[PDB]
């Protein structure tokens, strides 16, 4: 019993964190085999950031300009290439701590663990969700760029995020490990704003199922709803539309608890209408949306 926001064990990722220094700029890199991945803005100055021409800035660099540090050992850069917004630094040593890994691009609503690093050293691990507006509500300070987001299902680390920037609202934007940004963001200091955020509906429903599995039933009601009527109500509270995919995904939790998805949708409609009335669900006074249906099944079963 119990429900916690749980991150994956960070050990496999810790052994990949390195420090990347280019001029006055120092950030984190991900050392996998003989390649160190890092945000390409490591080659920029604060001046270059407004309208940088990364191809132009990168052609002027040589391998000895990139100082890569793995613990107390300096790695030797033997090549460099750019793939979208990520810089790939070919090094002369393959990381012996390289785990079984994949590069996966995630969809909004998906969760992952973040190993926050500064100067190539891990400081903490926390759980995140890719928000519907493609930002992440992380905890990042200056020097955290290059910190990665990941999932460790089985013995394979799926890297899904690399931190690149903080938006004016304190939310974070980054790319997958192929350098493609999540969202309409660019690695420039030009005016950028996160779009209006929405609540990840399928995740709130999954978390209501986790509460039922943990013995919390006060929020359940005798009502059901059509999928369309649920969405018409949900949209008014800035909740993401619930698709038939989401309803299918929630099927196992619906079978395990005996509460139909549209039946749980009716509880959610009621919670949106009434609030909690001094009550909590899984120790929270708000509806939690950073637990996917997969996270709930993994943690509860």
Ligand X SMILES: CN1C[C@@H]2C[C@H]1CN2C(=O)C[C@@]1(C(=O)Nc2cncc3ccccc23)CCOc2ccc(Cl)cc21
Contact 209, 296 (CB under 8 A): yes
Angle, helices 293-300 vs 201-213, to 10°: value is 20
Contacted entry of Cl ion, ligand X, a second copy, none for residue 241, CB cut-off 5 to 8 Å set by kind = none
Kindly write out the interface string for residues 98-137 of this chain, putting x where it contacts ligand X by CB under 6 A and - elsewhere.
Answer: ----------------------------------------
Strand partners of residue 22: 25, 66
By CB under 6 A, the count of residues binding ligand X is 18
- Of 176 and 187, which CB lies nearer to Cl ion in the complex structure? 176
Rule CB under 8 A: say whether 252 interacts with a second copy.
Answer: no
Q: What is the distance between the alpha carbons of residues 18 and 147, in angstroms, rounded to a whole number?
A: 10
Residue 238 CB coordination number (10 Å): 11
**CA–CA dist 278, 299 (Å, integer):** 27
Restricted to residues 33-62, the positions that interact with ligand X (CB under 6 A) are 41, 44-46, 49
Number of C-alpha atoms within 13 angstroms, CB side, residue 77?
23
Alpha-carbon distance of 122 to 113, in angstroms, equals 13
172 lines the binding site for a second copy (CB under 8 A): yes
Length in residues, the chain: 301
Catalytic annotation present for 41: yes
Number of residues in contact with a second copy, rule: CB under 8 A?
Answer: 49
**Does 25 help bind ligand X (rule: CB under 6 A)?**
yes
7 binding a second copy? (CB under 8 A): yes
176 neighbors 161 (Cβ within 8 angstroms):
yes
CB of 123 to a second copy, least distance (A): 4
- Does residue number 206 form part of the binding site for a second copy (CB under 8 A)? no
Instruction: Yes or no: say if 41 and 26 are a contact pair by the CB < 8 Å rule.
Output: no
Nearer to ligand X, 190 or 274 (CB): 190
Q: How many Cβ atoms from other residues are within 10 Å of residue 55's Cβ?
A: 8
- Nearer to a second copy by Cβ, of 11 and 241: the residue is 11
With CB cut-offs between 5 and 8 Å by kind, which of ligand X, Cl ion, a second copy, none does residue 46 bind? ligand X
Judged by beta carbon, residue 26 or residue 198, the one nearer ligand X is: 26
Among Cl ion, ligand X, a second copy, none, the one that 106 touches (CB under a kind-dependent 5 to 8 A) is Cl ion
**Which value, in Å, is the radius of gyration of the alpha carbons in the chain?**
21
Q: Is 283 in the site for a second copy (CB under 8 A)?
A: yes
Rounded least distance, CB 54 to a second copy, Å: 26
Angle at 30 between CA 8 and CA 158, to 5 degrees: 40
Rounded to a whole number of angstroms, the minimum distance from the CB of residue 149 to Cl ion is 12
Residue 142 or residue 196: which is nearer to ligand X going by CB? 142
The span from the CA of 218 to the CA of 244, in Å, is 26
State which residue, 81 or 107, has the beta carbon closest to Cl ion: 107
Element housing 117 (H / E): strand 111-118
Cβ 172 vs Cβ 166: under 8 Å: yes
- The span of 33-41, 141-149, 201-209, 220-228 binding a second copy (CB under 8 A) equals 141-149
Annotated catalytic sites, by residue? 41, 145
Binding site for Cl ion (CB under 5 A): 106-107, 110
């Amino acid at each position: 019993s119990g429900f916690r926001k749980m991150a994956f064990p960070s050990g496999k990722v810790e052994g990949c964190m390195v420090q990347v220094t280019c001029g006055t700029t120092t950030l984190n890199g991900l050392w996998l085999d003989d390649v160190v991945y890092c945000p390409r803005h490591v080659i920029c100055t604060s001046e270059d950031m407004l309208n940088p021409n990364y191809e132009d800035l990168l052609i002027r660099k040589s391998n000895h300009n990139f100082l890569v540090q793995a613990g107390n050992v300096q790695l030797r850069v033997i090549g460099h290439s750019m793939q979208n917004c990520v810089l790939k630094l070919k090094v002369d040593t393959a990381n012996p701590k390289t785990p079984k890994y994949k590069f996966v691009r995630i969809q909004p609503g998906q969760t992952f663990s973040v190993l926050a690093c500064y100067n190539g050293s891990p400081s903490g691990v926390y759980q995140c969700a890719m928000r519907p507006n493609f930002t992440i509500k992380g905890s990042f300070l200056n020097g955290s760029c290059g910190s990665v987001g990941f999932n460790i299902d089985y013995d394979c680390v799926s890297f899904c995020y690399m931190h690149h920037m903080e938006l004016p609202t304190g939310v974070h934007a980054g790319t997958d490990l192929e350098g493609n940004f999540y969202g309409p963001f660019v690695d420039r200091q030009t005016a950028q704003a996160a779009g209006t955020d929405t609540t990840i509906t399928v995740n709130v429903l999954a978390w209501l199922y986790a509460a039922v599995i943990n013995g919390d039933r006060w929020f359940l009601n005798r009502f059901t709803t059509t999928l369309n009527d649920f969405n018409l109500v949900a949209m008014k509270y800035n909740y993401e539309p619930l698709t038939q995919d989401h309803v299918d995904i929630l099927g196992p939790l619906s079978a395990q608890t005996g509460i139909a998805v549209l039946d749980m949708c009716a509880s959610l409609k009621e919670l949106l209408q009434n609030g909690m009335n001094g009550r909590t669900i899984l120790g929270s006074a708000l509806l939690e949306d950073e637990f996917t249906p997969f996270d709930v099944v993994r943690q509860c079963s």
